[PDB]
A paper describes a structure:
The conservative residue exchange Y5F led to a slight, insignificant decrease of IgE binding (1.46-fold). However, Y5C exchange had a stronger effect (9.03-fold). This can be explained by a more pronounced change in the protein structure, affecting the mutation site itself and the changes in side chain conformations of the flanking residues Phe3 and Thr7. Because the variations in these protein structures are strictly localized to the immediate environment of residue 5, we concluded that Tyr5 is part of a newly identified IgE epitope and involved in antibody binding, which might be due to IgE sera from different patient pools in this and earlier studies.
Residue numbers in the entry: 1 to 159
The structure:
């Protein structure tokens, strides 16, 4: 079955720039700006669009060793990005995939709002509980703030 979770968060970075950096250039940025969160990102196959598979490895001591994420859809006009966690980490005999949707919208003050949906597709009769969702939110927030700090400090990056 499916467990649906949603959250929103804010950024001080304008939407288009944040989408170009945080969403479209994570493979480069996350290990650079948040090395204590992400040890590496490997592109396994594909050229960036639907179907691209990346292997995201976590540092030693983290709960999970890695996940593989698959890009589902990329909307450059509306700053929407869909991807799924398809292997590793929590994926296995209790959990088939986690499908995610991110949308970034501009705010009049020159920042943005990120709207995030996470849909857990379980196998069998298993509950997706609060702690698991909190950890994913914490990871996302950490990555966002690290990219935000980098973009504030490197004004010529991603214009
Ligand atoms: Na704002």
């Amino acid at each position: 079955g499916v467990f649906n979770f949603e959250t929103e968060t804010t950024s001080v970075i304008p939407a288009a720039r944040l989408f170009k950096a945080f969403i479209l250039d994570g493979d480069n940025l996350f290990p650079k700006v948040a090395p204590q969160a992400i040890s590496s990102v490997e592109n396994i196959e594909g050229n960036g669009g639907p179907g691209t598979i990346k292997k995201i490895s976590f540092p030693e001591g983290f709960p999970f060793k890695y996940v593989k994420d698959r890009v589902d859809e990329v909307d450059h006009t509306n700053f929407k990005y869909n991807y799924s966690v398809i292997e590793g980490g929590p994926i296995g005999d209790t959990l088939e995939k986690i499908s995610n949707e991110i949308k970034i919208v501009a705010t009049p003050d020159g920042g943005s709002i990120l709207k995030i949906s996470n849909k857990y597709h379980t196998k069998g009769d298993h509950e997706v509980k609060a702690e698991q969702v909190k950890a994913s939110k914490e990871m996302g927030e950490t990555l966002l703030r690290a990219v935000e700090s980098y973009l504030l400090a490197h004004s010529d990056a991603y214009n």
